[PDB]
Amino acid sequence: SLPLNPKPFLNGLTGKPVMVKLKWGMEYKGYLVSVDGYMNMQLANTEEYIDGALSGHLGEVLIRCNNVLYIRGV
Template identity: 75%
Template structure:
C-alpha cells in the first residue's frame, strides 16, 4: 500500500522559547496530510474534451478545453483564456503548454 503525504503550511501560536511570557509567538510550521494517489495518464485521458484550468509555476492560469496530451504530458488547449491574479488577460485560442511549466491541472465547471 502506498500512502502519499502532502505538506500543508499553517500558522501556530507557540509559547516557545520564552515559557514564562504571557504573549505567544506566532510561527509557521509544516504538517503532513494524506492525499489519495491519482495516476496522471488516465486522469488526463478522462479530462480530454472537457474544460480545464491549468496553473503554471509562474502564477498564470489558463482555462480552455483539453484537446490532447502526449507521452510527456504536454497539453494542447482550445478556446483558451489567460488569467493573471484572477483577472482575464483575454482570449488566446489554441495553446500548447510544455509539461515542465505546469503546476497543476483541474477540471473546470462547464458553465464558467
C-alpha cells in the first residue's frame, strides 16, 4: 500500500481480533480494545497460547509496551 505506518495500522486493527507475541515467547489472542502512545495494549476475551497451544482463557488484559515483540491481526 501507499505508505502504511505503524500507528494507523494498529488503529485500523482496534476493534479486531489480534495476537501479540511477547519477547518472552508467550502469546495472547483477543480483541484489541485500544492502544496508547507508548504502545501499551488492551485486549478483551484474551486467550493465552504458550508453545502455540491454548493454555488459559483470561478475559480483559493490559500488556505493558516494553514486553511486546510484535502484533498480528488474526
